[PDB]
Amino acid sequence: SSILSEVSTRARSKLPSGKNILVFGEDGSGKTTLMTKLQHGKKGRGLEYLYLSVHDEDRDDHTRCNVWILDGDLYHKGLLKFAVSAESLPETLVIFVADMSRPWTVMESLQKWASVLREHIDKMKIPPEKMRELERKFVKDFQDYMEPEEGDNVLTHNLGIPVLVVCTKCDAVSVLEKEHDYRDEHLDFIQSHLRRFCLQYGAALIYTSVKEEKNLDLLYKYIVHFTTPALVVEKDAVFIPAGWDNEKKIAILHENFTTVKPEDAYEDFIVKPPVRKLVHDKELAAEDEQVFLMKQQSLLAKQ
């Protein structure tokens, strides 16, 4: 009656299921423009869903890669519940997006978003305890595969699942050195911290710009199931796939006159345009007076 229905359900297996993406939209930074360059109503609510259904390596078999874009911080945790389930967990390509117009934001705000998801790990994954004892070992599998066939040990992190740190607004390099960069220290230090962040986080570092770098879908399609050779060469736009690291190449990079590993220069680039000034500010507390007070004060002034 239904035995052959069982066999019929077992006929084919070329069925890539419901894929998910959790990008972290960060105050403009071309995020609406990021999906626009990829493929827009308005961006004021956050959790602005998008669905990707792109080429399934030979045709498009509706690679149903559901996107999610949050922006701000006002309790959007429940929205993450509406974006992260218990079965969503494998196909969870989280993408951290930040600009270059404000690189200092990126430096800390990445950890802001990160800590939000660290909470969400211990807030939503606390009931599924099977992927604790399973996915941590699967991450021990997974991050051993982070490094080979690309082209030992590092002080990596606790976060391990398919993760990725991207950057945006990079075609503003000359605009920023035109304003205040004009120093290889500023260019090397940020990349050392970024590539450093990604290698610790068990992720990779990717850049993009206005009308540039279609290297995005390569790693996602490549991972969410087409490979590509890396670049740290141009240094005006960088692509770091996972496993193209060490803790020495970058050490030589932040050595070439770059104030060797400064743990205060966060204020250097977190001081040029964020501690620029305030043009439109009206904190004056201008004027206000009394009646009776002035009257009797003039009485004392009457002598």
XYZ file of C-alpha atoms in Angstrom:
303
model
C 0.000 0.000 0.000
C 2.868 2.340 0.886
C 6.013 0.146 0.675
C 6.682 1.242 -2.874
C 6.011 4.830 -1.775
C 8.966 4.357 0.585
C 11.111 3.145 -2.321
C 9.843 6.030 -4.496
C 10.886 8.524 -1.809
C 14.275 6.785 -1.913
C 14.600 7.017 -5.734
C 16.614 10.261 -6.090
C 19.010 12.075 -3.762
C 20.147 15.111 -5.826
C 18.085 17.359 -3.543
C 19.981 20.225 -1.865
C 17.624 21.319 0.956
C 16.813 24.652 2.616
C 20.027 26.684 2.929
C 20.402 29.723 5.206
C 22.608 32.834 5.538
C 22.926 35.238 8.483
C 24.658 38.373 7.389
C 25.005 41.182 9.906
C 23.960 44.448 8.204
C 25.926 47.294 9.704
C 24.537 50.855 9.403
C 24.504 51.308 5.689
C 28.001 50.055 4.740
C 26.521 49.100 1.381
C 24.489 46.220 2.786
C 21.314 46.987 0.837
C 23.822 47.649 -1.915
C 25.520 44.318 -1.115
C 22.487 42.319 -2.045
C 21.811 44.838 -4.818
C 25.262 44.192 -6.289
C 24.561 40.528 -5.766
C 21.072 40.863 -7.279
C 15.359 46.680 -2.736
C 12.373 48.078 -0.841
C 13.767 49.936 2.182
C 16.189 49.357 5.065
C 14.822 50.636 8.359
C 13.372 47.559 10.009
C 16.200 45.022 10.169
C 15.828 41.239 9.622
C 15.237 42.188 5.966
C 15.078 38.741 4.509
C 16.312 37.814 1.086
C 16.312 34.452 -0.600
C 19.051 33.215 -2.822
C 18.260 30.543 -5.376
C 21.229 30.624 -7.709
C 23.004 28.167 -10.050
C 23.272 24.634 -8.585
C 26.681 24.018 -10.270
C 25.184 22.911 -13.636
C 21.796 24.680 -13.771
C 19.818 26.275 -10.985
C 18.037 23.669 -8.896
C 16.766 26.511 -6.718
C 19.716 26.714 -4.304
C 17.284 28.048 -1.691
C 19.859 29.968 0.310
C 17.721 32.127 2.558
C 19.472 35.369 3.532
C 18.910 37.418 6.702
C 20.026 40.994 7.379
C 19.790 42.621 10.820
C 20.894 46.184 11.573
C 21.010 47.904 14.936
C 20.887 46.352 18.359
C 17.428 46.914 19.896
C 16.596 43.380 21.118
C 16.772 41.735 17.718
C 17.503 38.404 19.504
C 13.980 37.078 18.930
C 14.391 38.015 15.296
C 17.471 35.804 15.279
C 15.206 33.095 16.708
C 13.079 33.682 13.626
C 16.257 33.325 11.582
C 18.117 30.513 13.453
C 16.333 27.266 14.257
C 17.638 23.980 15.654
C 17.842 22.392 12.196
C 19.006 25.558 10.463
C 22.376 25.121 12.277
C 24.420 23.230 9.571
C 23.662 25.525 6.622
C 24.399 28.659 8.645
C 26.879 30.751 6.708
C 27.159 33.729 8.989
C 28.677 36.718 7.247
C 30.007 39.664 9.161
C 29.827 42.824 7.063
C 31.486 46.125 7.814
C 32.740 49.145 5.901
C 36.005 50.913 5.272
C 34.516 54.385 5.642
C 34.684 53.719 9.376
C 37.320 50.984 9.943
C 37.372 51.608 13.676
C 33.763 50.577 13.874
C 34.694 47.248 12.259
C 37.572 46.561 14.691
C 35.269 46.440 17.755
C 31.759 46.222 16.227
C 32.815 42.899 14.760
C 33.240 41.663 18.317
C 29.954 43.403 19.165
C 28.111 41.266 16.599
C 30.286 38.301 17.535
C 29.378 38.480 21.226
C 25.715 38.774 20.201
C 26.038 35.471 18.389
C 28.080 34.032 21.304
C 25.052 34.745 23.438
C 22.788 33.206 20.756
C 24.998 30.103 20.939
C 24.420 29.806 24.654
C 20.806 31.033 24.378
C 19.445 29.015 21.479
C 21.837 26.109 21.197
C 21.641 25.492 24.978
C 18.626 23.116 24.549
C 20.137 21.165 21.550
C 22.924 19.485 23.461
C 23.561 16.918 20.712
C 25.468 19.314 18.478
C 27.552 20.283 21.508
C 29.071 16.800 21.813
C 28.578 16.372 18.039
C 29.208 19.700 16.290
C 32.233 20.513 18.443
C 33.811 17.268 17.247
C 32.452 18.033 13.786
C 34.165 21.403 14.092
C 37.332 19.612 15.097
C 36.821 17.698 11.840
C 35.747 20.835 9.939
C 38.547 23.202 10.972
C 41.157 20.599 10.174
C 39.716 20.977 6.662
C 39.884 24.751 6.989
C 43.559 24.619 5.890
C 44.426 21.815 3.366
C 44.368 21.893 -0.422
C 44.335 25.678 -0.371
C 46.931 27.704 -2.235
C 49.722 23.336 12.481
C 48.207 25.386 15.299
C 47.054 28.928 15.994
C 45.248 30.528 18.941
C 41.769 29.995 17.481
C 38.357 30.469 19.155
C 35.405 28.604 20.571
C 33.207 29.643 17.678
C 33.270 26.987 15.029
C 30.481 26.340 12.511
C 30.667 27.679 8.890
C 31.646 31.287 9.589
C 32.972 34.125 7.470
C 34.077 37.720 7.979
C 33.710 39.948 4.941
C 34.401 43.671 4.534
C 32.783 46.301 2.317
C 33.338 49.959 1.245
C 36.908 49.104 0.244
C 36.946 51.270 -2.932
C 37.555 54.300 -0.758
C 41.277 53.560 -0.135
C 42.568 56.641 -1.949
C 39.769 58.673 -0.366
C 40.941 57.627 3.090
C 44.635 58.183 2.429
C 43.484 61.448 0.890
C 41.947 62.192 4.256
C 44.298 60.573 6.736
C 45.667 57.095 6.032
C 48.765 57.674 3.747
C 50.837 55.210 5.756
C 51.536 51.539 5.265
C 51.077 51.112 9.043
C 47.393 51.977 8.683
C 46.958 49.512 5.843
C 49.011 46.655 7.364
C 47.689 46.893 10.935
C 44.015 46.610 9.990
C 44.636 43.614 7.755
C 46.697 41.939 10.475
C 43.838 42.419 12.919
C 41.239 41.320 10.390
C 43.054 38.201 9.153
C 43.899 37.644 12.829
C 40.214 37.874 13.804
C 39.133 35.440 11.077
C 41.814 32.839 11.813
C 40.888 32.935 15.483
C 37.139 32.818 14.776
C 37.581 29.777 12.525
C 36.529 31.984 9.596
C 38.082 33.729 6.609
C 38.626 37.362 5.543
C 37.005 38.720 2.368
C 36.863 42.238 0.905
C 34.546 43.816 -1.661
C 33.817 47.232 -3.093
C 31.574 49.421 -5.194
C 31.478 47.585 -8.567
C 34.051 44.942 -7.672
C 35.035 41.512 -6.471
C 32.596 38.781 -7.418
C 34.474 36.300 -5.236
C 31.590 36.008 -2.773
C 29.405 33.210 -4.272
C 32.545 31.193 -5.002
C 33.163 30.395 -1.336
C 29.489 30.109 -0.384
C 28.444 27.861 -3.261
C 31.779 26.072 -2.700
C 30.881 25.644 0.988
C 27.058 25.536 1.130
C 26.889 22.512 -1.313
C 34.071 26.428 -8.337
C 37.266 26.792 -6.299
C 39.507 29.812 -6.742
C 43.116 30.910 -6.118
C 43.649 33.461 -3.346
C 45.088 37.028 -3.251
C 46.825 39.075 -0.506
C 48.951 40.563 -3.282
C 47.276 43.813 -4.480
C 46.758 45.098 -0.876
C 44.169 47.549 -2.230
C 41.607 44.717 -2.149
C 42.305 41.439 -0.286
C 40.904 37.886 -0.386
C 41.838 35.501 2.378
C 40.297 32.045 2.037
C 40.468 29.875 5.107
C 43.797 28.135 5.574
C 45.952 30.681 3.790
C 47.242 31.814 7.166
C 49.926 31.336 9.777
C 50.952 33.628 12.597
C 54.191 34.792 10.914
C 53.408 36.152 7.407
C 51.104 38.656 9.078
C 53.779 39.201 11.732
C 56.193 40.350 9.040
C 53.368 42.486 7.630
C 52.809 44.396 10.879
C 56.625 44.630 11.277
C 57.449 46.664 8.126
C 57.592 49.980 10.078
C 54.138 49.158 11.454
C 54.453 49.922 15.171
C 54.960 46.310 16.168
C 51.731 44.926 17.706
C 50.427 48.081 19.385
C 47.566 47.450 21.759
C 46.435 51.089 21.863
C 46.499 52.055 18.094
C 42.883 50.985 18.067
C 42.549 54.586 19.158
C 44.805 55.661 16.200
C 42.314 54.631 13.580
C 39.640 55.050 16.296
C 40.701 58.620 16.601
C 41.127 59.997 13.132
C 37.522 60.145 11.854
C 35.610 59.002 14.972
C 37.436 61.420 17.189
C 37.340 63.874 14.348
C 34.836 66.387 15.736
C 31.148 67.204 15.875
C 29.979 69.658 13.215
C 26.266 69.671 13.836
C 26.039 69.716 17.629
C 23.764 72.026 19.605
C 24.622 71.289 23.245
C 24.362 74.923 24.324
C 21.886 75.285 27.251
C 21.654 78.841 25.899
C 19.526 80.973 28.255
C 16.562 81.182 30.654
C 15.794 83.682 33.455
C 13.320 84.455 36.268
C 10.931 87.250 37.311
C 10.560 87.700 41.066
C 14.230 86.855 41.514
C 15.399 89.618 39.179
C 12.986 92.031 40.833
C 14.229 91.567 44.400
C 17.816 91.334 43.183
C 17.312 94.781 41.735
C 15.830 95.697 45.139
C 19.152 94.773 46.706
C 20.734 96.762 43.881
C 18.587 99.777 44.861
C 20.697 100.332 48.037
